Amino acid sequence: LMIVNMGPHHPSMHGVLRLIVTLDGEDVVDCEPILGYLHRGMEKIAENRAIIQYLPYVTRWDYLATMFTEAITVNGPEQLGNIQVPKRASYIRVIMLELSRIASHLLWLGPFMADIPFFYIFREREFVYDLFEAATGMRMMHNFFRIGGIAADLPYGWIDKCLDFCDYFLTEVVEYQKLITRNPIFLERVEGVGIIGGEEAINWGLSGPMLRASGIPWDLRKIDRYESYDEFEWEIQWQKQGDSLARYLVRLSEMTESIKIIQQALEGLPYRFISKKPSPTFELSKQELYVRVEAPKGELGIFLIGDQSGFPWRWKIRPPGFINLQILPELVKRMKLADIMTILGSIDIIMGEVDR
């Protein structure tokens, strides 16, 4: 039972974490996940900062998809103050949020395919960041979410590049879909892990790909009527193969479902930039409001107890992947050191929203 140190510079690059295991032989049997490495104290500083000052702070959580964090932390005060967003800016927010979900799943499967290369996905990613530069102007550090919608307007080149992104992107996606059917090393090196079912993934804490992996059509934005999700084409992954390749088909189907949503929303266009802007500064109320949105990892959440002041009295975040991290102590029992790379890939986690 030689204790692994599981150091800060991992052989993989998926964050800094600590997974000391007794590992009798090569079989790992007992996990003790030590965290607190990428920690910044978001709750107390968010109690010490306003919404327009913790609004630059929402970038250090799920920075592979930064639209979700600022999206939920601006959708908090919109439903809190009951201020209506017009349909145009809300649908463009839906388009860019699904594009960030696309970016999150491809930036998962990039380094996951690198561990188990970079320019096989970067030939898409250069046009993806060109879309981010034509949408807000930054690469992943955007500050463009207001109460009335997008802080700016879409330029006349971004809608043309958004029309071109579908037949720029879906063809290389379906050229990348047939690899797991062709290449048997993904049928023999990541096949098998992920043995949890649906009645158990509901039982512990799970959401997102680990909950859809069992053949459950789960969606917050389908159950909760949000952003007119029943107008668009939906196909939530009812893939019941359980394992890690079931999760890969889950993520391919989620990317293709977002492609279908954006492709139906290419020519929608139902309406200004910011509705209800009389003054630059405002405040918040005091309610008992827990707002949640469909994360790419499953139910990102914002807890809020107001102060009727410039600062929020309570600001607690429920990150999706940190609740997802609870299952590895149970998904460690009968695997190997060559398996934990596939495990910490298939969790689909970065340490930005973990410690926070």
Partner: protein
């Protein structure tokens, strides 16, 4: 208020020795090869631009360093002790970043932890910013003539036992 160096002379003042010093310094300024050290928001530049933690002396700290990260970080600098230095490439390796006031478990820069040559603007710039940073580091090492191989150990220690109370 500073100290005083020795500054006696330059003993290696032949043409062959200064030629070899210039060529070794320019080749030292040519072969960066970092250990990557991503695992944060500055990992995203690696896909656009080893594993032995004693090998690559020319590492740049492209990560958000915290107080719990600090013992492994100073141990890793002990694993890169003499030849080369580190490059701060996240405002949190410089000033603590965006949480420079109120964060308890985040160090206000690694400028109180490790010698740093170059300070970046911080939050993920364009992928040619790291190229300009390693070019400016190459200009820095080109100024260095390997200090004419001039060496001092302090070795401060007490052999009196502390008033310990373990678990």
């Amino acid at each position: 208020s500073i100290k005083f160096p020795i500054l006696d002379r330059t003993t290696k003042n032949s043409v062959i020795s200064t030629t070899l010093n210039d060529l070794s310094n320019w080749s030292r300024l040519s072969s960066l090869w970092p250990l990557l050290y991503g695992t944060s928001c500055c990992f995203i530049e690696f896909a656009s631009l080893r594993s032995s933690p004693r090998q690559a002396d020319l590492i740049l700290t492209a990560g958000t360093v915290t107080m719990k990260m600090a013992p492994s970080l100073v141990r890793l600098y002990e694993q890169m002790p003499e030849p080369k230095y580190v490059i701060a490439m996240g405002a949190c390796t410089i000033t603590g970043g965006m949480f420079s006031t109120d964060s308890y478990s985040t160090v206000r820069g690694v400028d109180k932890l490790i010698p740093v040559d170059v300070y970046l603007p911080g939050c993920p710039p364009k992928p040619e910013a790291v190229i300009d940073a390693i070019t400016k580091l190459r200009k820095k090492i080109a100024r260095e003539i390997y200090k004419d191989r001039i060496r001092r150990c302090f070795t401060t220690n007490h052999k009196f036992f502390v008033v310990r109370s373990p678990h």
